[PDB]
C-alpha cells in the first residue's frame, strides 16, 4: 500500500518558499513547484523555475498574468512552448511584463500533464506518494488562513468547490500515533517564509475534501 | 489569492 506519511522536502524535491507579493500569480508558483520536483526526480538537480516566464507568456493558453490563471494552462504552455526558463534567468518582479522567453535559458520541459480525479482524496494521496509534489487549488479566502500559524488548519467556512488559490502539496502525514486520524496534507504556499509555518500549512486531510484540495489537482509529465 |  501507500506510506503512512510523505514529505518530499526531506528528499530534495522542493525549493525554498517564494513570495508572489501583490500579483495574482499563485497559479504560477504552484505550476513551477510541481515542475521543480519533477525535473528533480528526472535529473537529480534542483533548479528554481521562473514564475515570471509564465505570467508574461501564457496568455494564449488562457492565463491572465497577475490577474489569475490555472496550473493546468501553465503546464499546457510549457508543453506548447517547448520549454521554461530558470528564476535566475527570468526573475520575478510581480507585475505583468513583456514576454521575454528565451529558449537557450530553458531548464525544464513537459509533454503535457496528468489530472487527479476530482474530489478524490485517495487518488491524491496516491499521486503525492508515487510522483512527487502535486499542484492543487484550494479555497484560501479566509481570515483564519491569512492568520494561520500552526497545527492542522480546519475552517468551517471553507468551500470544496469554489476555489481561488493555487498551492503545492509536498506531502502528507498525521499527528500522534494512530496513522489514521488527525491527518493532514503538507502544503507549500507562495506568501513567503514568514507566513504560516515557515511558509507551509497543514490542511485537514480525509475530512471531506477540505478547502477543495483534491478538487483540481494535476502534475506535469516530464 | 493574495496575502492580506
Ligand atoms: Cl493568485
Author numbering:
A (entry chain AA): 1 to 222
B (entry chain PA): 444 to 447
Which text from the study accompanies this structure?
Addressing the elusive specificity of cysteine cathepsins, which in contrast to caspases and trypsin-like proteases lack strict specificity determining P1 pocket, calls for innovative approaches. Hence, we set out to determine the crystal structures of cathepsin complexes with representative peptides of cleaved substrates. Reactive site mutants C25A and C25S of cathepsin V were used in structural studies.
The pattern III group (binding shifted to the primed side) consisted of structures of eight non-protected peptides that all bound uncleaved into the primed sites. Electron density maps in the region from P1′–P3′ and partly P4′ of molecule A enabled an unambiguous interpretation. On the non-primed side, the MPD molecule occupied the S2 site, and the CL- anion occupied the same position as the carbonyl oxygens of P1 residues in pattern groups I and II. Peptides from patterns I and IV bound to cathepsin V consistent with the observed protein cleavage sites, whereas the peptides from patterns II and III did not bind according to their cleavage site found in proteins. Their binding appeared to be biased by the absence of the negative charge of the reactive site Cys, which caused a shift in binding. In its absence the affinity for the negative charge, as manifested by the binding of Cl- ion, prevailed over amino acid sequence of peptides of group III.
